[PDB]
Design a binder for this molecule. Sequence first.
Ligand code: CU
Ligand code: CU
Ligand code: CU
Ligand code: CU
Ligand code: CU
Ligand code: CU
Ligand code: CU
Ligand code: CU
Ligand code: CU
Ligand code: CU
Ligand code: CU
Ligand code: CU
Ligand code: CU
Ligand code: CU
Ligand code: CU
Ligand code: CU
Ligand code: CU
Ligand code: CU
Ligand code: CU
Ligand code: CU
Ligand code: CU
Lengths: 295, 295, 295
Amino acid sequence: IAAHKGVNQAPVPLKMERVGPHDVHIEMTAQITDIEIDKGKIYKAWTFNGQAPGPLVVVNEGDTIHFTLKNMDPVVPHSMDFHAVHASPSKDFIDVMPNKSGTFTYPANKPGVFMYHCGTKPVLQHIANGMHGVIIVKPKNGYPTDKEVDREYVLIQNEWYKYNDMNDFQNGVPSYVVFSSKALKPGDPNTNGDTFTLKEKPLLAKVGEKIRLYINNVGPNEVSSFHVVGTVFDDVYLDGNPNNHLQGMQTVMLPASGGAVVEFTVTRPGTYPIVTHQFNHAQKGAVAMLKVTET
Amino acid sequence: IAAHKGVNQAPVPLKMERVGPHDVHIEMTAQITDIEIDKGKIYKAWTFNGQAPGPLVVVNEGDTIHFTLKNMDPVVPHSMDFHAVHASPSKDFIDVMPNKSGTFTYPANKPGVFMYHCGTKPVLQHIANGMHGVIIVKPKNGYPTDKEVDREYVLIQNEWYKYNDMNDFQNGVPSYVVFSSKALKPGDPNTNGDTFTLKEKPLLAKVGEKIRLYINNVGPNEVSSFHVVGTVFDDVYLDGNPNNHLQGMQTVMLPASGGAVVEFTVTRPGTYPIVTHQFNHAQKGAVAMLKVTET
Amino acid sequence: IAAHKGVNQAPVPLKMERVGPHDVHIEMTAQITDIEIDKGKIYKAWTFNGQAPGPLVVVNEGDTIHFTLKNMDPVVPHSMDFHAVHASPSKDFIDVMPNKSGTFTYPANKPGVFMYHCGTKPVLQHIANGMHGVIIVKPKNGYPTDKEVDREYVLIQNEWYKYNDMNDFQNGVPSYVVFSSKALKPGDPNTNGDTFTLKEKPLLAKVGEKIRLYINNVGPNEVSSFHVVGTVFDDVYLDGNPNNHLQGMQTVMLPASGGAVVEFTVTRPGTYPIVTHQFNHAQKGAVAMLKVTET
Ligand SMILES: [Cu+2]
Ligand SMILES: [Cu+2]
Ligand SMILES: [Cu+2]
Ligand SMILES: [Cu+2]
Ligand SMILES: [Cu+2]
Ligand SMILES: [Cu+2]
Ligand SMILES: [Cu+2]
Ligand SMILES: [Cu+2]
Ligand SMILES: [Cu+2]
Ligand SMILES: [Cu+2]
Ligand SMILES: [Cu+2]
Ligand SMILES: [Cu+2]
Ligand SMILES: [Cu+2]
Ligand SMILES: [Cu+2]
Ligand SMILES: [Cu+2]
Ligand SMILES: [Cu+2]
Ligand SMILES: [Cu+2]
Ligand SMILES: [Cu+2]
Ligand SMILES: [Cu+2]
Ligand SMILES: [Cu+2]
Ligand SMILES: [Cu+2]
């Protein structure tokens, strides 16, 4: 796209604020930003806020979201679809034109780990170019295992294809498949979907801890066979809904857009890989590391 | 196939009749019928009754099916495999020769949303050419959420490949991936697997209704990441068995041949897309629409 | 690999012995062995013990495994990752050099049907070349349906690609997808992953029996839509954990590395195919047979 030649819009922080006991404002941008998805490989991503996947959103069950999208793309319209919400797609997930803003309001009444993404036709194009992310909705009554958890992180799986190539997007294998982590608390890492950052700077934990991961596979196209090497998942909640409780899974099948809360114990010091067990995808990037130490 | 050149057998209605409290007769044809799977693209499908997917069958839990297949194909043998039934495959799902009939009898003792398909070697060939469908077996004690449901529809996902090309069938990506709807009650739509009909003539519903969909992904080859835009599934029963109950799923993973009953609320007027969230497949056709109005 | 030219190491039996109430020794080899994966097609597989998938391991919940790997490969290092165990991957699943042994110790505290495989970088390469298998961990309190089961078998699904071709492994479709069976009791078959053996020598059962299958899809890359023709699964335990109980599934979705215990009734004499319902994979080999007789 001629109007994207040379464009590299600096990342803008997510803006969020509570405005009532059950109402939150969120303000994001749609923007065009160069991301290093593999060593030496820059993708001029279509993004929310200059991150791909986008910034993490966390709300409470029962919160109504008042969402603003500021479209900084000079020529392409963009939109937002939160899977967490009940909305009219043809009124509430509609396009915001270049250089304009739009505000939409809708309730998040279901707990879980939900995908969000741009909803602009062709959706495949907007997702594959980078406009995806996760919104967590915290359950009003928690999870039955909350008292057991020592540490938590968010991981997101996505694919990258040949740049803005709709033939490849529809008909080709992924060039890269990657994990990213999004911060839940100060000091947590916050990364983009790339083949290396979570290998080089592993997530951290202590020996004997029970770890919770909030996970979502945003696709666009692949399913995920989520596995942590050297452990077994003690508890799994499908889509992060507390009622969808499985125990003792070695690997969690995630559809495209599929989420879960998973919990596991790291019993020994060492480095623990985190993979999709579809090993072709792992080989093309989708391995993160968790470094477990005595401190 | 030389004997299929020029053949376009008119669709024949499904014949069904109850013959006892726990016995039903079903009579289908195997026939060769031109179907428009994409605008301008005719596929000379191998079908049951000149529909692809085939006609919907609905029986009650505990019904014995007395099934007749009349084979109208001039040269290819065909057969029937109902996933709902307990049968001897090598006695009961056997071939009926061109211009002959065969009758087979077997019980449907398990509730759910089951695939049926031709079982003639090579099965991939017969399925991919169009000989697939769904049989619903209604649970004797219903579903715990039955009283909540306002409206219901059936949707089926399938793929189409290069015409009768076994190399493509085994080794290629789908050319199209599509939804169809099959009628449960008078006035419901009844369509074939195509890229456009359920976009142009959406399914209908009223604001505030809880909708049930009976869904099956017949493949032949792909898995499905079933999602309704603008809502969350309140209840999901895997394979339509009432015991396999999940809550608050954003997306349901269906294997090839996999079924579910899913229920969700449409809270606002508008058009709600229904997709497989494997967006490559969506882009190649698998988007249906549900139009929700104040009346 | 020049040092593998002409090498065909005879299969070595698995060595296992109990050494305490909650401790077992297991001794395996890594070795290079010619396997006939399709009629006329030899693959010079990287194996455990000259079988691909590897020998079946069965332990009890709560057993600590003292595992020895003797590496008979003249030039490639190998390792072992059991999904059943809690271990430090970077201390316990490490490489054993050619012509050396290594001993590692770790607990199996979770019941189920777990994948094991070589963990040597690039893992995709080691898995795809044949270094995969299953370890069953028997639950201390059994399965609620144990008293109903008449007969049991183990089946494993895997893929084969172009020989030792990492481009194909990462980016290509499988050449073959196959089932194998591993012996649980004397007299059971014990086979390798090939396109024909379980068609030509079906598994055996008697009319009216409830059959249990312990199943795992080791990949490396594909998911599995596991189905037995002519029946419905009465009970399914995901990953073989007794808590993950589904009922009346026609087809079980398995991730790559995914396992299950499944149970079904064969009501009539005949031959019952067992497939992945991803029919492209079935066509490329993944059909086994169960022959059900009056005796
Ligand atoms: Cu309040
Ligand atoms: Cu507001
Ligand atoms: Cu966009
Ligand atoms: Cu979506
Ligand atoms: Cu792919
Ligand atoms: Cu702890
Ligand atoms: Cu664990
Ligand atoms: Cu009766
Ligand atoms: Cu009759
Ligand atoms: Cu047929
Ligand atoms: Cu079938
Ligand atoms: Cu495909
Ligand atoms: Cu209502
Ligand atoms: Cu909803
Ligand atoms: Cu003891
Ligand atoms: Cu020992
Ligand atoms: Cu190895
Ligand atoms: Cu593994
Ligand atoms: Cu493939
Ligand atoms: Cu019995
Ligand atoms: Cu059955």
